[PDB]
Amino acid sequence: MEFTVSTTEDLQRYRTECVSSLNIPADYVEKFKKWEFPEDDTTMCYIKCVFNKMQLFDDTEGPLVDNLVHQLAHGRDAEEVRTEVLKCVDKNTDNNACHWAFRGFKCFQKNNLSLIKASIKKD
Ligand SMILES: CCCCC/C=C\C/C=C\C/C=C\C/C=C\CCCC(=O)O
């Protein structure tokens, strides 16, 4: 079972295809490059697509905890990472998948953004 962690280089690939597919305006893309994600439905579906191609989010189960700690805990205790992730894992009470994935991402980065940058970083 070969698991390929998504580095920054891989991330630039997935994110590009999601951009060209979801008709994401280049202006928004500039924001994303500076790690700026506006609270808007465009950005939300963008995050969903990216997180999906990275095999990190599913439209049914939501955030894939296993892959999440395997990815994020790049250089940190996976058990603690699992915990922090779970504190951002919720149910789709909003009933929109783009916003669901976006809420998980937004929740986590607001407390642990450095880990996100490090997870995709080749140490
Ligand atoms: C339930 C909480 C889940 C939190 C998951 C958060 C991040 C997923 C883990 C690793 C992803 C690391 C970097 C990718 C982050 C945003 C997608 C690219 C956005 C962009 O390129 O502009």
How many C-beta atoms lie closer than 10 Å to residue 99's C-beta? Answer: 18
Is 15 known as a binding-site position?
yes
Asked how this structure was determined, the answer is NMR
Looking at ligand 1, which residue's alpha carbon is closest to its atom 2?
104
Q: Which two tokens stand for residue 75?
A: 């250089």
Q: Which residues pair with 117 in a beta bridge?
A: none
The H or E element that residue 57 is part of is: strand 57-58
> For residues 49 and 13, what is the distance between their CA atoms, to the nearest angstrom?
12
The pick from 72, 103, 117 for probing ligand 1's pocket by mutation, whose C-beta has the most ligand atoms within 8 angstroms, reads 72
d(CA 86, CA 81): 9
Q: Using CA atoms, how far apart are residues 48 and 27, in angstroms rounded to an integer?
A: 19
CB 72 within 8 A of CB 109: no
Distance 96 CA to ligand 1 centre (A): 18
User: Helix or strand or coil: residue 62?
Assistant: strand
* Cα radius of gyration (the chain): 14
**Ligand 1 mean position to 51 CA, how many Å?**
7
- Name every residue whose Cβ is closer than 8 Å to that of residue 61 and which is 6 or more positions away in sequence: none
Return the best residue to mutate from 51, 55, 74 for the ligand 1 pocket (most ligand atoms within 8 A of CB): 51
Segment holding 58, helix H or strand E: strand 57-58
Q: What is the dihedral of CA 117, 17, 46, 73, to 10 degrees?
A: -30
Q: Please tell me what DSSP assigns to residue 121.
A: S
Q: Is 63 helix (H, G, I), strand (E, B) or coil?
A: strand
Residues near 59 by beta carbon (within 8 Å), at least 6 away in sequence: 48, 52, 97
